[model samples]
Target chain A: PQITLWKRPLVTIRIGGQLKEALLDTGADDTVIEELNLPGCWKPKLIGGXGGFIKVRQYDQIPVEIAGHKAIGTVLVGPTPVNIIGRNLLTQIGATLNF
Target chain B: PQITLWKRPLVTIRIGGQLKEALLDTGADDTVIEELNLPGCWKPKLIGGXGGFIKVRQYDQIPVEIAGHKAIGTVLVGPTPVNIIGRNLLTQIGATLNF
Candidate 1:
């Protein structure tokens, strides 16, 4: 893959009433962020495998995947690391990897 | 014109502590669903056109499209009919109609 094209498109996300526009980088290894947990927050279901690394956070090591690539990353119950598409995501049906 | 497949993929959505898995259908005319309004819900940015229709509620009408497929129908600010991806969307940078 000479040309790094995005298979997952980034959607405009409004977190805590703030809009943060970021790239849909499936090459992302993990959901990077750090902050104290806040009540009344929605924790989206995360599905992926380990990114083959380590870093301690919130008393537990988290495994994250992008697009189809998986990796280890710091997981926070808060918002900080703008969401980027990673590679270790499962194959989503009806979704084509076209740039 | 013979081969029909999906270009959009349905991702896992956790709403109000509930998981509803539906297809990312671009054939959907409009996002339909009637229910009570909940507080603290994150609203994703919406981009599309008027689907050539009208409605009473919201006191205003809007258009919508699908995977190049567009339609018109009743719209709701609530969650009931579920989110159905429509056709009148722009060319998302990294997405493909992989089906």
Candidate 2:
């Protein structure tokens, strides 16, 4: 419709008490948080990935108030350079793109 | 066209006996598997990535029902293909690359 669904609704979310803005990507599978000050004590799951796998857990999803509508979706914690909204709750609302 | 209404209809999930059709999105922050072989254990959370400041439970929103009903949203669980929803799910989901 407008270049792979990835370019659809550009959901802008406020993170880390306004440190940066994130995009809500329907094409993505899950929300990724690539931050550094998360205390690192709440992760604990031995998972797999491309570079490799690691143990993580107990993370939180940022609060999303899309179009003035607020919805709370917690994030599956990890360390990276990119962050996004993917599967988690996108389905709860059967999320779609409208840009 | 915002949904300002009821949740939208989901789709059929392709199951692989245990897993299901999914995506391989590296841009994501976490690996969200909506299902699992872990008996008695049920639930998902948002993990590391953009909006995921915390790694908690997640959910699979595909509306279709399938064997194992595995809407497997295991997007980015590390040991991954970089970000999330690795080759496991994406290949199965019949995902179309737009790059």
Candidate 3:
């Protein structure tokens, strides 16, 4: 499916048995979720964004389903204003930017 | 053009008679350039992002050409880590996300 840029390109994602909407961010290098609790041990990490750096819990090998496409990778849980599915996951789902 | 998410979807943009590389960001609501001097009167503004808020100078009606596609819109100059071509300008170029 082709998603127009008229609005934020948000898609439904299933993670930790919960459904949530996340933005498909081509600019983001890593996937970041807004304060979600996940199973398994996570390491404390700091990641940079548009503004500055933020502390987050990095969980590895997490499976996420984005708009029916599945991907398993590292996910960061932090104080982000919104959930962003970045290039890490986007690549796994074969997402592309087309003009 | 179709850009694979395996790498960052960066494109050359011409602005203010200068060329720079920018990421095609579908998640960002506004376009942001990293610390570039632009002509005209701009207002001091703050914008939110994955980490936090940042102070920037907002300049409107700026003409930018992204990979040959032209767009004129509001552009923000700040201490951003990278230049981001957000949805604001991506819409103008008819960029879309496809899987």
Best candidate (score: DockQ): 3
**lDDT for residue A21 in candidate 1, whole number 0-100:** 42
lDDT of 3: 0.92
**Model 1 steric clash total:** 36
Indicate the residue-level lDDT of A62 in model 3: 95
Q: Candidate 2: misplaced stretches above 4 Å?
A: A1-10, A23-29, A36-41, A54-57, A60-62, A66-69, A97-99, B1-99
* lDDT ranking, best first: 3, 2, 1
What TM value does chain B of candidate 2 have?
0.29
Better of 1 and 3 by TM-score: 3
lDDT tens per residue, model 3, B1-99: 989988888899999999999988898889999997999999999998876789999999999999999999999999888899999999999998988
Worst 10 residues of 2 chain B by lDDT: B1-10
- lDDT by residue (tens digit), candidate 1, B1-99: 111222224434333334444334332333433343333333433322111222212211333333333334333343333353322221222234332
lDDT of 2 by residue, B1-99 (tens): 222112222223443233344333424434444423332333544344322234334334332223223334433222222223433343343332221
TM-score of 2: 0.40
- Over A1-99, each residue of candidate 1 has an lDDT whose tens digit, in order, gives 121222224444332323444333222333333344423434453322111222323312344433333434334332333443222221221123342
Indicate the residue-level lDDT of B59 in model 3.
99
Fnat, model 2, is 0.08
CA lDDT, candidate 3, residue B72 = 98
DockQ by candidate, in order: 0.07, 0.08, 0.86
Cα shift from native, residue A21, model 3 (Å) = 1.1
| Per-prediction TM-score | 0.23, 0.40, 0.96
